[PDB]
Write a protein that binds this ligand. Structure first.
Ligand SMILES: *C/C=C(C)/C=C/C=C(C)/C=C/C1=C(C)CCCC1(C)C
Ligand SMILES: CCCCCCCC/C=C\CCCCCCCC(=O)O
Ligand SMILES: CCCCCCCC/C=C\CCCCCCCC(=O)O
Ligand SMILES: CCCCCCCC/C=C\CCCCCCCC(=O)O
Ligand SMILES: CCCCCCCC/C=C\CCCCCCCC(=O)O
Ligand SMILES: CCCCCCCC/C=C\CCCCCCCC(=O)O
Ligand SMILES: [Cl-]
Ligand SMILES: [Cl-]
Length: 260
């Protein structure tokens, strides 16, 4: 059902996808140690934001690791090219995992924004819009080989949820940044633009079967996911952590003031 299963891969292409995924694991588990150790320097009001990055690191790290092992299980070097064997490789597992990682990324943003009834109501609408976007995207990617028109349609429905979700995010950011301490009102605007850039890479990767239906396209989609994953989880995570420690320090939390 996926474009990955259509082609044989050169040693170069196969190895590069393997390296990308393996690097992904490395980066997320390395970042996982950073967030764990710096969590002691975050005040109790914001400590869950740092804990959420740890959850994200392990979740994304486990899926990338599963993808890497599935990649190597599925293909073998036969007559000069990596060819598909008994098992299959699919990007479908990422979609399933986004059901958990996307709410996590959104929740840590809400915490550093100083959201408190307001927090539960905003989290529910965000998670429902996020699940709507993920589910419609998952259905759409089932047709990336058999029905391009269907991929485009479910993609349009997914984009509508993405846009409304982004509008909720931006509205809350640009409204609640005045509550933010230690000059983090400036930082949070950059986090908004970082999310807009990084999350927009996922629907681009989704559209790869439409404009680059070949093995090089398979490499590109994995490259795009790698850039997007590192930017949206790791880089985003580090900015959320800085915002949490800076605000904690401005709020009189001694470990944060000493660590800075
Ligand atoms: C760490 C993983 C993250 C931040 C996943 C983000 C996923 C998206 C922003 C999903 C985007 C999609 C569209 C807006 C349309 C096509 C289908 C999707 C689900 C790939
Ligand atoms: C086999 C894969 C190779 C392993 C790559 C992991 C090497 C670690 C390098 C970058 C990971 C990103 C984590 C950044 C540490 C946080 C410190 C900081 O930037 O403030
Ligand atoms: C790899 C992991 C090595 C363990 C280092 C992390 C120590 C955590 C200490 C703490 O902050 O409680
Ligand atoms: C609630 C919104 C969810 C879905 C909207 C329905 C439109 C997608 C149907 C496309 C399937 C098809 O091509 O037959
Ligand atoms: C901010 C996210 C950074 C992600 C780092 C990705 C590292 C790879 C970047 C550039 C190397 C490009 C190498 C060219 C690939 C050749 C494809 C092939 O093997 O056939
Ligand atoms: C070229 C590679 C891209 C740059 C690498 C990005 C690494 C870390 C950025 C996250 C750090 C948090 C923002 C800085 C906060 C500040 O010092 O004001
Ligand atoms: Cl506190
Ligand atoms: Cl993920």
């Amino acid at each position: 059902k996926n474009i990955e299963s259509l082609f044989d891969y050169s040693a170069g292409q196969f190895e590069f996808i393997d390296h990308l995924l393996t690097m992904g694991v490395g980066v997320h588990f390395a970042a996982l140690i950073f967030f764990l150790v710096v969590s002691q320097f975050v005040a109790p009001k914001y400590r869950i934001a740092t804990a959420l990055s740890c959850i994200v690191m392990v979740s994304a790290g486990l899926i990338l690791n599963s993808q890497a092992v599935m990649w190597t299980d599925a293909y073998a070097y036969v007559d000069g090219s990596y060819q598909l064997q008994d098992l299959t490789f699919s990007n479908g597992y990422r979609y399933v995992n986004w059901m958990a990682t996307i709410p996590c990324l959104l929740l840590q943003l809400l915490i550093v924004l100083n959201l408190k009834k307001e927090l539960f109501s905003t989290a529910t609408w965000l998670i429902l819009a996020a699940w709507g976007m993920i589910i419609t995207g998952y259905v759409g990617q089932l047709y990336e080989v058999d029905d391009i028109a269907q991929l485009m349609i479910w993609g349009a429905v997914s984009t509508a949820f993405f846009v409304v979700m982004n509008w909720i995010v931006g509205t809350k950011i640009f409204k609640n940044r005045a509550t933010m301490l230690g000059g983090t009102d400036s930082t949070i605007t950059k986090v908004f633009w970082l999310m807009m850039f990084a999350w927009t890479l996922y629907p681009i990767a989704y559209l790869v079967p439409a404009f680059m239906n070949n093995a090089d396209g398979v490499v590109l989609r994995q490259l795009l996911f790698t850039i997007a994953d590192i930017s949206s989880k790791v880089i985003y995570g580090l900015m959320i952590t800085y915002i949490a420690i800076q605000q904690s320090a401005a709020a009189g939390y001694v470990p944060a003031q000493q660590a800075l």
